[PDB]
Design a protein around this ligand. Structure first.
Ligand code: NAG
Ligand code: CU
Length: 223
């Protein structure tokens, strides 16, 4: 139970729910076939925002995860419960207008993921114990313009069966400047990119102890 509730760019936090479409409820989406898997949604309620955040291509932005919209701190309990082990992931989608595009459908490409490292520590644990910070590189080689940024944490503590995996995501509204457009990513759809039978979605992280993990979705796009 967590919310990506603000974005930091060039060392500056852009504001609570400012350029990030935030729910007030911190509950997960558990149905990978729902339209809500793209940018959150029903049975949650997601606020709109007119702010579109300018970011230079080739630089990193930082999604800031918090337990609730009211959360002031950045200690582990202020981010997400430590039971919620799983990957962090981020995607972009080129859109006409980042303030109005829904995010549902094709066009997403993956730009970051952090599953389990060689010491057995999960991406979500780095966020939980790193002040809620989820660092994501905007590729240098994509076309400039309006994008949605979908940042996600998947909690797998209750994922032995499907439904079970808990998907926490929000979309930020970006204006990417300085992208060269040298490469056009292959894309996937939300809903569509994840299935309940994926080895990273239906997974007992305890029986047996997991030593390696396959993050769901496509390969990370690289320049
Ligand atoms: C920028 O984000 C990328 C992932 O997209 C990562 O490879 C890199 O470590 C990040 N830079 C940081 C955290 O300073
Ligand atoms: Cu939870």
């Amino acid at each position: 139970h967590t919310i990506f509730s603000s974005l930091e760019v060039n060392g500056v936090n852009q504001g609570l729910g400012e350029g990030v479409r935030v729910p007030t409820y911190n509950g997960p989406i558990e149905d990978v076939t729902s339209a809500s898997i793209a940018c959150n949604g029903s049975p949650n309620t997601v606020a709109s925002t007119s702010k579109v955040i300018t970011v230079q291509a080739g630089t990193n932005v930082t999604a800031i995860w918090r337990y609730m919209l009211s959360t002031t701190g950045d200690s582990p309990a202020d981010v997400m419960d430590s039971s919620h082990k799983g990957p962090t992931i981020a995607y972009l989608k080129k859109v006409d207008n980042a303030a109005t595009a829904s995010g549902v459908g094709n066009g997403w490409f993956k730009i970051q993921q952090d599953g389990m490292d060689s010491s057995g520590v999960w991406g979500t644990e780095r966020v939980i114990n790193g002040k809620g910070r989820h660092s994501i590189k905007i590729p240098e080689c994509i076309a400039p313009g309006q994008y949605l940024l979908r940042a996600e944490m998947i909690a797998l503590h209750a994922a032995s069966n499907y439904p079970g995996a808990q998907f926490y995501m929000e979309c930020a509204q970006l204006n990417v400047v300085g992208g060269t457009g040298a490469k056009t990513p292959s894309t996937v759809s939300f809903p569509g990119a994840y299935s309940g039978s994926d080895p990273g979605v239906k997974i007992s992280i305890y029986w047996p102890p997991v030593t390696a993990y396959t993050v769901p979705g496509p390969s990370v796009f690289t320049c």
